Design a protein around this ligand. Structure first.
Ligand SMILES: [Fe+3]
Ligand SMILES: [Fe+3]
Length: 107
């Protein structure tokens, strides 16, 4: 499906911060909370791909784009951040703040 790919693409391209998640997903919730902690709400979109008839297609495409099919899947300005563990590594090592500074999202 070109449709599925185009839909995922629109989410990644129209939102600087894009998070693909699922229902009752602790590491989705943790990653989303970290990002909101940087006051990124206005530029974030969270998509629950479990509430979707094409979940498996979406997951397979996210694997093609990022190397993993699991949620959460996190993109920042179309760059692959990865999962919540990747986000925690970038956050602790100063890379997440640098990303956001280059985007004008944090001073
Ligand atoms: Fe449950
Ligand atoms: Fe949505």
């Amino acid at each position: 499906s070109e449709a599925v790919k185009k839909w995922v693409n629109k989410i990644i391209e129209e939102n600087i911060i894009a998070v693909f998640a699922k229902t009752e997903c602790p590491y989705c919730i943790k990653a989303i909370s970290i990002l909101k902690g940087y006051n990124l709400n206005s530029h974030m979109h969270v998509e629950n791909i479990e509430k979707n008839p094409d979940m498996a297609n979406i997951q397979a495409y996210l694997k093609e784009l990022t190397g993993k099919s699991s949620v959460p899947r996190i993109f920042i300005n179309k760059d692959v951040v990865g999962g919540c563990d990747d986000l925690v590594k970038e956050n602790d090592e100063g890379k997440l703040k640098e990303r956001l500074q280059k985007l004008g999202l944090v001073n």
